Amino acid sequence: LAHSKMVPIPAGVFTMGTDDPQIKQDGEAPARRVTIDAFYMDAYEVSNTEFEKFVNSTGYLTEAEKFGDSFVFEGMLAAAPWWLPVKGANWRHPEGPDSTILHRPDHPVLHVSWNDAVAYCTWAGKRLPTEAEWEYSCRGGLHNRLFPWGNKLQPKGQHYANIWQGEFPVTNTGEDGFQGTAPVDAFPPNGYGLYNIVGNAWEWTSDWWTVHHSVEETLNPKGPPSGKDRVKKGGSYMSHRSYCYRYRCAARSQNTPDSSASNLGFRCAADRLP
């Protein structure tokens, strides 16, 4: 296992966002041309095992452990009735105190806040990606497509990401092989070598959230200089066409930096190899 391996993301120019926004309130539009310098991206979401190495090394207590609770999705025991703040839910106990990660060491780490993620990435000699870096990487060298692999959800009749099948939130059929999270190396890689960049766990980025974007061309943009929420990308194992259609590279959402939940993780990036 090499679940902390990084891949080189080539220098290039790409179209960020879309002029055919599917969720207009999220500022998916306008499409804008963004130039990104070559850098490195984690191939995988950070796994439980990799996060445990960090905690073993530093003694780091995550914000959810300090707060004493975190949000858990009801269907596997708030912003929605299916989200409960569960006392004692955290990265080691993803559904609460009588859950464990012992049988899922290679699944993405969850209940990690933006601050937790920055701590991990920095410890590792890395950083969070910007939203623009994240999206460029997600798109995997294709232009103006819905998904890392193209415009069809199940190309060649194959599942390409871990999202929801069935009627959300009552019934997840597990058609794609995973009801909850999958191992960080599950499903095909995209054109750049990235796994689970859409679906599985949501992923934190470094940017403050705004929905107001210029059409101006930019170089290595960092997002707005201030805000209250940080940007997350990519959707999760819970995502579905009918409710949270955000397993698209252009999609975007946000949370306050001290937030944590059972569907939210991260991956790191770096300017050079650590």
Partner: peptide
Amino acid sequence: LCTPSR
């Protein structure tokens, strides 16, 4: 809404 904030 996909993840509630704390």
